[PDB]
Write a protein that binds this ligand. Structure first.
Ligand SMILES: CCCCOC(=O)[C@@H](NC(=O)c1c(-c2ccccc2)noc1C)[C@@H]1[NH2+][C@@H](C(=O)O)C(C)(C)S1
Ligand SMILES: Cc1onc(-c2ccccc2)c1C(=O)N[C@H](C(=O)O)[C@@H]1N[C@@H](C(=O)O)C(C)(C)S1
Lengths: 242, 242
């Protein structure tokens, strides 16, 4: 079952914005969205690709553990937080593209292609530069295919080791308190039209898990905070979080 | 209820191919597929677009009835059956692209877009050339979206006349005997990757209707007969046909 709930369109209208939110209730095995068509439209994943990229780099030994230091290469880039030493935890937190480009070059085309076929990930197409196909190449994924992928990660059912899956879930930690835990990854696709923002992940409660995937039109970086704000307005209306 | 049935994958691996078959049982309102992900992935419709294009041409009076002759323009093309006079029945049987390109020019961009919105047909996007957008422009549709559309046609529920719907169902007639009737349309998309074959339609029994939509990888035109043969192997396994 998928069920359409157009009342969530209010949360987008409030900000003169357009997009989709998809929720999956793990206990009841039912899905909900404001737009069934856009829920199945495939886009470039941009920084959401850092979840499968991390899994592959750990399983092949390109990354030894979550404390290994990746030293700054000395090139001043326009994002201040990229101009420093990182590990896996900080490289995911600050979406540090140059660290992930170096992992992809060491994984290589052949192993990257075989791993994405085993994950059943989006359209499985890596055409383009081995170190930029998720930003300006031929790979495409829908919000519903993001949920399918994330459910397998949650249950340790991807073909890679239990250990690789546990470390990446630790790196995805975004928020936690007495009411909920959020594990998630942001993305911003800016190189090829149409320009879109992503937020994909899940909410852990005492007795259930809600998986989510949202995308929205992002003509400039001024609206990037709306990825989390709009998603949290839907979770409150559904009584998932206070 | 959607159920995944991976035993059907044997009919694709037998012929060294890959694809999806989707079935819908009208009496039970239940669907079956070998591949839930591919069942909801969007592709160019190619010649399966002759179903909506026929419906719109009839309803606007571009085509008067099933007997009206469309005289060959006297340009020699590749397919020998295209180099002769046609009516609606023979144009759909032989998939005569040049006849349908002239229908699209007389319908025009504004009326074509309005009718695809009224039908809820795929992504409803006609961007590209008015006479080739279903071959190489922006329009996309999934196997499950082809079923939704065909169910409305079967029940005379699309927003055109009853007369337009009855004449198109006549032009779709493919096979009939004492056990079953098949109404359907073939497609073959090669202008954009991946290259795919389509077969969409339904099977009329004495007391039920089974809707189907299949697509499969088609690297050369040598495998085109597999569109029908693999679909009939699934129908036989499920005891829908003898
Ligand atoms: C190795 C250098 C790679 C840069 O790779 C990009 O394509 C990045 N994009 C941009 O720097 C932007 C932005 C913009 C502006 C303000 C704040 C954020 C982004 N506007 O246009 C371009 C071009 C990175 N791509 C994103 C992603 O991978 O999701 C990002 C948020 C990490 S930012
Ligand atoms: C979480 C998170 O937690 N803290 C910050 C933060 C705090 C202060 C400064 C910068 C970031 C942060 C965040 O925003 N991280 C961003 C993110 O991945 O969503 C990335 N980094 C941005 C950038 O460095 O500007 C970017 C536009 C490259 S995408």
């Amino acid at each position: 079952e998928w069920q359409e709930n157009k009342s969530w369109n209010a949360h987008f209208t409030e900000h003169k914005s357009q997009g989709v939110v998809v929720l999956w209730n793990e206990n009841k095995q039912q899905g909900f969205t404001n737009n069934l068509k856009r829920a199945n439209q495939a886009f470039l994943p941009a920084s959401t690709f850092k979840i499968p990229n991390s899994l592959i780099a750990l399983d092949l030994g390109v990354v030894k553990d979550e404390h290994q230091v990746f030293k700054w290469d000395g090139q001043t880039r326009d994002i201040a937080t990229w101009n420093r030493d990182h590990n896996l935890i900080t490289a995911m937190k600050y979406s540090v593209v140059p660290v992930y480009q170096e992992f992809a070059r060491q994984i290589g085309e052949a192993r990257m292609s075989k791993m994405l076929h085993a994950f059943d990930y989006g359209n499985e197409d890596i055409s383009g530069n081995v170190d930029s196909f998720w930003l300006d190449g031929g790979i495409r994924i829908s919000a519903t295919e993001q949920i399918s992928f994330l459910r397998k990660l949650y249950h340790n059912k991807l073909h890679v080791s239990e250990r690789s899956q546990r470390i990446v879930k630790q790196a995805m930690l975004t928020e936690a308190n007495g009411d909920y835990i959020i594990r998630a990854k942001t993305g911003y696709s800016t190189r090829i039209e149409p320009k879109i923002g992503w937020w994909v992940g899940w909410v852990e409660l005492d007795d259930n898990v809600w998986f989510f995937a949202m995308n929205m039109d992002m003509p400039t970086s001024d609206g990037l905070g709306l990825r989390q704000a709009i998603t949290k307005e839907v979770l409150k209306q559904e009584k998932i979080i206070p």
